[PDB]
Design a protein around this ligand. Structure first.
Ligand code: CA
Ligand code: CA
Ligand code: CA
Ligand code: CA
Ligand code: CA
Ligand code: CA
Lengths: 691, 691
C-alpha cells in the first residue's frame, strides 16, 4: 500500500531477440510496462509510479525492469505467478477444460484484470508511456525459440498474407490468439461473406436476365431510336445554365437503365428482403453455435431527466445540422466540379471532407458523453456505439437519400418552377434519371471507396510504424513498443465500417443488383486486410470475451426494417417501373390508348408531358424552340386544368402507393413467417447444450 | 409396488359438516377421490384401483376411504405426511420463507404432482369418477371449525360478493388460495380494467367532442335537410327486391355517423395505438413485479416434417372453410330475418350457432392435435391455444371483417353490376353505410352479448348445480362433489373471452370510441362474476404456477400490430372521413369546386355519381324514375369514359393509400420509440432484485 521498494531484479539484457521470458527464462511475460523518468512534475510522477509498482509487487505480481538499448526509456516485465493465476481463475469464472496450462491470451487478460483492480489512468495522464502484452514472434519469421509456438507466423502465413486469400479462415486460431471479440468479428465477417456470395449469384442471375432482354425492352429501344426518342425535345434541367436537350443521351442512359430497371430487379428486391431475413436468422443460429463452442457466456431525479432531454435535443440539433451540411456540401461540390471522370474526383473530395468531419464527429461524440458518462463500460460503450453509428448513418446515407427521395421529387412544371428563395430553382435529377444517378453513386461508393479504404487501411498504420522507426538487435518488448497501439474502440471502427457496408447493400438493393457482388469482393479483400494490419502493424490488445457483436445486432435489425421500407420507396418513387407497368396495363388500351392488346410501344411519347412557351421567360433565350416535354404527368397546355395533375398522374401515384402497401405488407408477413419458422437456436446446438 | 393392502383406517363419519381433517382430526385433507365399485371389467377395475391405492400408501401418502351418506359412492381422503411434504419441497423448487407450515394450496399442488407421477388417466378411463381438493368452508357461511381460517368465506365476503364491486382485489389472497395461474389471470384483469379506465375517460372525451359538434358537421345536416339530402334519389340496393329510396333514412343514420365519424375518432385511434403500447409495456413491468412478489420463477425426420406440413395445410383448409361458412351463415341469416329488434334476434341466433360450431371447433382442434401430440403440456397447450384462438378469431372477427373490408367494396355500377354467378348481385352495404353497420354490430356485441354472456356465466353453472343436486347433513367431500368441475382448459376460456374483447376494443376502435368504456363496465362486472362462479359454483382446481399469461402475450402483440393496420384500413376504406377530407381540401376549390375557401358544404351532391337508366333493366319496373345516384366515383353517363373511374376516384383512392402509409409509419415509429424509451422492468423492481 506504500512505495516500500522498487521492482526486483532490475537487470538489462537485449541479446535474445525473440524471448518472451525473463532473464532466467523460467517465467514468461504476460505484460510489459513502459515509463521514462530520468528527465516538480518529475518527482511527483516518480513517487506515484513507485507507489503503483509497489502495489503491483505486493498484490503478488513480479515486476522485472530493463532500459531500452536504443537509454531513457525503461521497460518493466510483468508476469503472474502460478498462485496468482490459480486464485484469479477461481475468482474470475473461467471455463477451463478439466479431464503452460493457460494460453498467453487468457493470462494477459487475467493480468490486465489485476491491473484494472489495482492502470489506464496512469497511461492517460502521461504517467506510463505504454503497457501491453507481447506477440509470439515477428509476423514474417518463425520464432528463434523452438519451444514457443510461432502462431503469429502461422496466422500471417495461412490467414493474413494475401496469398492465402481463398483459404478458409482458421477461426479457432484467431480467437485463441487474439480473443473472443476479434474471433467473433472475423466469424461474423466470414458468414457475411458467404451470405453475400449467395445474394451475389442471385443478383448476377437477375443482372443476366435483364441483359438478355436488353434487346427487347421496348421503351429503351424507343429512347435509343432516333425516330421516337430523338424527336422528343426536353426542357432545360436548370435555370439559364442548361440548354434544350433531346432524348438521345438517354439512349445510352436507358440501355443501362433497362439493364438495371426491369422485373429482374424487383424479383431481386423481394428475394433480398427474404435474404436479409435468412441472413439475420442463420447468423443468430451461428452465433448460438459459436457461443457454445467458445463458451462466450461468462459473468463477473427530475434534474437528471431534464439534462437527458436537453442533451438528446442538442444531439438531434447537431445531427440535423450535419444533415444540412452534407446535403449542401454535395450539391456545391457537384456545382464546383461542373465547371464520369469528374464523379470520381468529386467522390474522393467528398471522401476527404467526410473523413475530416468524421474525425470531428468522433470528437463531438466523445464530448457529448464527457459530461454524462456513467463510466460503466458496457452502457457507455453501447451509447457511444449508437451515437457514432447515428452520425455515420447520417453522413453516408444522407448523401444517397437526397438523391433517392428528395432530389427532383419536389419541383414543379417548367412554367413557374419551385423557386426555393432568393437563390432558387432547386436542382432536378440528371437526364438519365434519379435511379441511374443513385446507381452510379452506389457503384462509386462500393468499388472506388472500398478499394481506396483498403489501401488506406494497409498503408496508414504501416506508414506510421515506418516513420516512427525512422526517427541493432532489439528485444520483444522494444519491438512491440514500436507498434501502433490499437486505441480505445478500435474494433468498433471495423464493425462500423462493415455495418455501413451492410446498410449500403440492403437499403438501396433495388437500384442495382450487383451490390451483393461488389460487397462480396470487398469482404474477401477485407478479411485479409483486417487480419494483416492486426497481425503485423497494430500492437497486441488484451483479450476479452463477447457473446455477440453487441449493439450492432439491433442496429442491423433496424437497418433491415428500414431496408424493407426503403426498397419499397425506391421501386415506387425513384424507379420508373410502376409508371411503365401502369401504361402497359391500363393506358395502352382502347379507353385511354389505341393498342388492342397490352403492350409497351408508344410509351415514352405518351408518358411525357408537353409544355409550350406560355410561361423573365429564360427558356426563349436558350433556343428558337416552342414546346418542350418534361418528366411529369401534368395536363397538356391548353387543357382546362393545364399543368395540374391529370387522371394519369393520380392513377400512377395510386399505383405507387398501392405497390408500397402491398410490397411492405407481403414482405413483412414473409419475414415474420421466416423468423417464426426458423428456431433462433439450432437443433444440434440444443442437443449439445443438453450434454 | 404391489397391491399388498388397501387404504388404512376405512371408517365412516359424516357428523362434522365442515371438517377438513380425517376422522382423527390430526391431519387435513389434501385430495379426495371418487369411485364406485360394488356395481369382467369390475374385477379388473377393482384390481387396478387397489394397486393404485397400494402404490399411494407405499409412496408415503395416507389414504382414508368413506362412502357417501346419501351408499355406492366411496370417497377417499388423501393426506401427505410431514416427511413427504418436506422431501418434495426439497425436490420441487419451492421458495419457502425462512426468517401447517405449507398453505393448503401448495400442499394440494404437491399431492397432485405425486398423483400424476405415480391420476388423470384413471379419471379418463372411468376408474375414478372425480378427483379434487376441498374448500375450507361454504362461501356464504363461516367455517364450523374455529381454528381453520375461513378464507373462502373472506374471499366471498370481500372479493366475490357483488356488493364489494368497488373494493380492491385482494390479489395476494386469491393467489394464495386458488393458485398463481388464477391469481395472475385476475391481476391481468385488474390491470386491464385500470388501463381501460384511462382509455375510457379519453374515449368519452373524444365522444363528447364529437357530440358537441354534432350541430356543426355540415354533411350530416345536408343529408338530413330535405332540400339537399332529400332530393337525392338513390338506386335500389339489391336486384328486384328493393325499391328506389331517397336519402332521408340517412338523416338519422348520418346524425349517428357524425357522432361516430369525426376527427375525435381519429385522434382517439392514434391515442389507442399509444395506449396499447403503454398497456403492453406496463403490463410487462407489472408482470416482472408480480414475478418478484409472488416468486413465480420456478423450474421442475423427413416424414415427420411432411406430416407437419400436411397438418398445417389441413388446418388452413379448415380455417378457410369456416370463414366461408361464417360469411354464408351471417348473410343467409340476414336474408331470413329480412322476411333494430331484428338485429338482436339475428344476433342471438348467430350466438347460438356460434356456440354450437364452437363446441364443434374445440372437437376438431383437439382432433387435429391428437395424432401429432407431443404430450408435453407446454408446447401442446400453446399449439391448442393458438389454433383455437385462430378459429375464434375467424368466427368473431370475420363477421365484422366482411362488413368492413369486403361488403360493398367489390361491386359495380348499377348498369351491369358485379354479377358473381347464377345467383348474383353481390350485396352492397346498408343505406346508412358500412361504418354505421359495423358500429351497430360492435355495439350489439359489446352491450348485448356481454350482458348475456355474464348472465349465462352466472346461471348455467348454477342451474347445472341445481339440477345435479335435484337428483341431510353433508360433509365437505359430498358438498364439493355436487359442484361443476372446471374441465380442461377452463381458464383458457376466460382468457379467450377477454382476448376477444381486447381484439374488439383495439382492432375496431376507429368505428366507435365507446368500446373502451363498454369494456370497462364489462370488466368491472367480469371480475366479480369470475370470482363468484369460481368460488361458489365451480369445484376447486389444483393450484399451479405461471410467470405470465402465456401465448396470450404474443397473441396480444399480434393483435396490436394487426390493430394498427386494421384501424388504418377502417379510417381509409370503411370510414368516409378521407373522402370528406379530400373534398374539403382539394375539391371545394376553384379548379374543381366553386367555393372560395375550403369548406364541406355541397359534399353529398358532389360525391355521388349519377346514373340514368341506360343499362332486363329491373329499374324501370320499380318506379317511373329515370336517374338514380349511387355511392361510387364513376363518370356520369354520357361521358367519353362513362361509368369508368374519373379523376376524383383516383385522387380519393390515392389519398386513402397515402393516409394508410403515413398513419402506419407514424404509429409504428411512435410504438417503437415508446417501447424503446420504457424499460421492460421497473426501477424499483430492479432495486428489490438487487437485494
Ligand atoms: Ca476496408
Ligand atoms: Ca476493416
Ligand atoms: Ca426465430
Ligand atoms: Ca363475461
Ligand atoms: Ca369471464
Ligand atoms: Ca422496453
Amino acid at each position: 500500500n506504500q512505495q516500500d521498494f522498487r521492482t526486483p531484479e532490475f537487470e538489462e539484457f537485449n541479446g535474445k531477440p525473440d524471448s518472451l521470458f525473463f532473464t532466467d527464462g523460467q517465467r514468461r511475460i504476460d505484460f510489459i510496462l513502459v515509463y521514462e523518468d530520468e528527465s516538480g512534475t518529475n518527482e511527483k510522477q516518480k513517487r506515484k509510479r513507485q507507489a503503483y509498482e509497489s502495489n503491483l509487487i505486493c498484490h503478488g505480481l513480479q515486476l522485472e525492469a530493463t532500459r531500452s538499448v536504443s537509454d531513457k526509456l525503461v521497460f518493466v516485465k510483468v508476469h503472474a505467478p502460478w498462485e496468482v493465476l490459480c486464485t484469479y481463475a477461481e475468482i474470475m469464472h473461467i471455463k477451463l477444460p478439466l479431464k503452460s496450462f493457460f494460453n498467453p491470451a487468457t493470462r494477459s487478460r487475467i493480468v490486465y484484470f489485476i491491473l484494472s483492480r489495482v492502470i489506464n489512468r496512469l497511461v492517460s495522464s502521461g504517467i506510463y508511456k505504454a503497457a501491453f502484452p507481447l506477440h509470439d514472434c515477428r509476423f514474417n519469421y518463425e520464432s528463434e525459440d523452438i519451444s514457443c509456438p510461432s502462431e503469429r507466423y502461422l496466422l500471417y502465413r495461412e490467414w493474413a498474407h494475401p496469398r492465402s486469400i481463398y483459404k478458409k479462415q482458421p477461426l479457432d486460431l484467431i480467437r485463441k490468439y487474439y480473443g473472443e471479440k476479434i474471433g467473433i468479428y472475423f466469424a461474423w465477417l466470414g458468414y457475411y461473406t458467404q451470405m453475400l456470395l449467395l445474394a451475389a449469384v442471385v443478383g448476377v442471375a437477375c443482372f443476366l436476365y435483364g441483359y438478355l432482354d436488353q434487346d427487347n425492352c421496348t421503351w429503351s429501344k424507343e429512347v435509343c431510336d432516333p425516330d421516337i426518342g430523338g424527336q422528343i425535345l426536353m426542357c432545360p434541367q436548370c435555370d439559364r445554365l442548361c440548354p434544350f436537350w433531346r432524348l438521345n443521351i438517354t439512349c445510352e442512359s436507358s440501355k443501362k437503365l433497362c439493364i438495371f430497371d426491369s422485373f429482374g430487379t424487383l424479383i431481386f428486391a423481394v428475394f433480398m428482403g427474404v435474404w436479409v431475413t435468412l441472413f439475420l436468422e442463420f447468423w443468430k443460429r451461428r452465433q448460438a453455435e459459436l457461443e457454445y463452442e467458445w463458451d462466450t457466456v461468462e459473468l463477473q431525479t427530475c434534474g437528471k431527466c431534464i439534462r437527458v432531454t436537453l442533451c438528446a435535443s442538442a444531439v438531434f440539433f447537431w445531427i440535423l445540422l450535419i444533415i444540412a451540411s452534407v446535403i449542401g456540401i454535395i450539391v456545391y461540390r457537384l456545382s464546383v466540379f461542373i465547371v464520369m471522370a469528374t464523379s470520381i474526383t468529386a467522390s474522393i473530395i467528398s471522401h476527404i471532407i467526410i473523413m475530416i468531419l468524421n474525425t470531428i464527429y468522433e470528437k463531438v461524440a466523445i464530448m457529448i458523453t464527457n459530461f454524462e458518462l456513467p463510466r460503466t463500460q458496457t452502457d457507455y460503450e453501447n451509447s457511444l456505439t449508437m451515437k457514432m453509428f447515428l452520425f455515420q448513418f447520417v453522413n453516408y446515407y444522407s448523401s444517397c437519400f437526397y438523391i433517392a427521395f428528395f432530389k427532383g421529387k419536389f419541383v414543379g412544371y417548367p412554367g413557374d418552377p419551385v423557386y426555393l428563395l432568393g437563390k432558387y430553382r432547386s436542382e432536378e435529377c440528371d437526364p438519365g434519371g434519379c435511379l441511374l444517378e443513385l446507381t452510379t453513386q452506389l457503384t462509386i461508393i462500393m468499388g472506388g471507396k472500398a478499394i481506396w479504404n483498403n489501401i488506406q487501411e494497409v498503408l496508414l498504420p504501416w506508414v506510421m510504424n515506418l516513420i516512427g522507426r525512422y526517427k541493432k538487435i532489439t528485444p520483444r518488448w522494444e519491438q512491440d513498443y514500436h507498434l501502433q497501439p490499437m486505441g480505445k474502440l478500435g474494433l468498433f471502427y471495423e464493425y462500423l465500417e462493415m455495418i455501413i457496408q451492410f446498410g449500403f447493400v440492403t437499403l438501396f438493393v433495388a437500384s442495382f443488383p450487383l451490390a451483393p457482388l461488389l460487397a462480396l469482393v470487398n469482404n474477401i479483400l477485407e478479411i485479409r486486410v483486417d487480419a494483416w494490419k492486426l497481425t503485423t502493424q497494430f500492437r497486441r490488445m488484451v483479450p476479452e470475451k463477447a457473446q455477440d457483436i453487441g449493439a450492432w445486432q439491433p442496429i442491423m435489425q433496424g437497418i433491415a426494417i428500414l431496408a424493407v421500407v426503403t426498397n419499397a420507396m425506391i421501386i415506387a418513387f425513384t424507379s420508373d417501373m410502376i409508371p411503365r407497368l401502369v401504361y402497359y396495363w391500363s393506358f395502352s388500351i382502347p379507353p385511354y390508348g389505341d393498342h388492342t392488346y397490352y403492350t409497351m410501344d408508344g410509351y415514352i411519347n405518351n408518358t411525357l408531358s408537353v409544355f409550350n412557351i406560355t410561361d423573365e421567360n429564360p427558356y426563349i433565350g436558350l433556343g428558337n424552340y416552342t414546346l418542350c416535354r418534361y418528366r411529369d404527368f401534368r395536363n397538356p397546355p391548353g387543357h382546362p386544368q393545364e399543368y395540374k395533375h391529370n387522371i394519369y398522374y393520380w392513377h400512377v401515384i395510386a399505383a405507387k402507393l398501392a405497390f408500397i402497401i402491398v410490397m411492405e405488407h407481403i414482405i413483412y408477413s414473409v419475414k415474420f413467417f421466416i423468423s417464426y419458422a426458423i428456431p433462433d437456436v439450432s437443433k444440434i446446438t440444443k442437443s449439445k447444450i443438453k450434454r
